[PDB]
Amino acid sequence: SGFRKMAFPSGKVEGCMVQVTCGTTTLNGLWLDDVVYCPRHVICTSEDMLNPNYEDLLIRKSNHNFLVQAGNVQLRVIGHSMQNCVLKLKVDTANPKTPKYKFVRIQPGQTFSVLACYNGSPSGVYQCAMRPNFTIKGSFLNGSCGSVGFNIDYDCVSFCYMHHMELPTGVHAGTDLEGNFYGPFVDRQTAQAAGTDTTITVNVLAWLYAAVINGDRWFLNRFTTTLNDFNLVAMKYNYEPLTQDHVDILGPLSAQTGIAVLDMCASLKELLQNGMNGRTILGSALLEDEFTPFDVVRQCS
Amino acid sequence: SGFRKMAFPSGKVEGCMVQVTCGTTTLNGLWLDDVVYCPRHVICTSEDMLNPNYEDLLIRKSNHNFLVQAGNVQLRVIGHSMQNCVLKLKVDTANPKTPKYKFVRIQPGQTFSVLACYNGSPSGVYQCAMRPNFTIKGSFLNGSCGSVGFNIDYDCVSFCYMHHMELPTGVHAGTDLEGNFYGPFVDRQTAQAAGTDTTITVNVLAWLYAAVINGDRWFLNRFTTTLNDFNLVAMKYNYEPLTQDHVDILGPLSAQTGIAVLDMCASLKELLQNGMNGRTILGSALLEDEFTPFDVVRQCSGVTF
């Protein structure tokens, strides 16, 4: 029993974290096989940040301008290339600790674990969700860029996120491991507002099924709703629209608990209308939206 | 910036988890050098479990009644013994991944990371605190027994918790790695219930400091209180008493921030009488108590082990 926000065991990623330094700039890199991936703004100076011209800055660099350190060992850079906003440093020794892995680009609402690192050394691990506005609400200080987000499935690490920047509002922006940013952001210090952060509705419903599953039903009611009527109400609370795809995805949890998705939607509508009235749900006094339908089945069964 | 519930990186512990089987009961073991540590209740049947005699139950067992597997490799048990509620299985192979480590015993209110495992296979890691009633509010399913809790200092794993059982209220009970129970619990299928939990006052104050560090400032007022005055409020709301030691521990945060401890206690005092009712601090509608002062400093300063 119990429900925690659980991250994946971080060991397979720990074995890949290195330190990358260019000039006075030091951040983290991900060392897989004979390639070190890191954010390309490692080649920028503070004087470059407002309008960096990455292609011009990179052409001026030679292999030995890049200092890569794995633990105590210095890795020799034998080549480099840029792919979108990620720099790929070719090194002369493959990481012996390279796990089975793949790069995947995730959708808003998807969860993953973050191994926060500084100077190529892991600081801590937490579980995260890609917000609907393509930011993530992380915990990151200076030096954390190049920390990665990931899921693990059996023994395969799927990398889905690399950290690049903290926006002025305190949230965090980054790329997939092909260097393409999540959301409308750019690796340059210019004004760029994140969209409105909405609540991940399908995730909230999944967590209410998790709450039923663990023996708590005080929030249910006798009502039901149409999909459209639910969305009309929920969007007034800044909830993401719920789609038929979302409804299908909750099907397994509906069957296991005997509660129709549209009935749980009715409970959510009332929860938004009433609040908690002093109670908690799986130990939270708020509606929790960083567990996915898939996560719930994972931790509960 | 930002503030999340952060576990230590689990890599060093992942390399120590193995699967231990005795009959039809299967759970997790901690493999360090040439010894595997696991709950002594792995030798019990469900009939034994009602009132076990462990010294007798163990006398009946023999080295080959213990099937221990590290991934796909089979480990030969070559000797066994009990220390308190922990079984120690001598194997023929030293764990080549054995990290620098020590066995420690923590106190209520201190935090640690749990690596939940199943059939010797790690599945998740999460941060939790030892409650004042010596339970932990973990997330364990069947087969999680033998999972361990730990802290990391530089390169040294401090093992502090081994998981033994789930109480009927859904909370969890375990031992240190020398098999001493945390809390007034016994490893027996019998009627047991934890005492009334309380709230870890020093941890709430530290999290409020974390909030101030992250720009969340509305709960500060201009008043000060005294310990006697605050503790009466604390005692009233099932909050742990606040000691002079706690104040000194929060000293650094009182400097880095400019809010004195009783200053912040006044804020917490005011938060306790009035409330919040759906309004938030650091993304929470309740007062979080599973971050120690050290957790807040370490996270808000980037310590990297």
Ligand SMILES: O=c1[nH]cc(-c2cc(-c3cc(Cl)cc(OCc4ccccc4Cl)c3)c(=O)n(-c3cccnc3)c2)c(=O)[nH]1
């Ligand atoms: O040596 C090093 N130098 C620099 C970094 C570094 C650099 C940035 C950064 C990078 C770019 Cl390309 C643009 C940018 O602009 C922000 C902004 C300002 C105004 C308006 C919009 C925006 Cl977006 C910022 C950063 O965010 N972080 C950081 C800090 C805290 C938490 N997480 C990440 C660290 C480093 O880690 N190491």
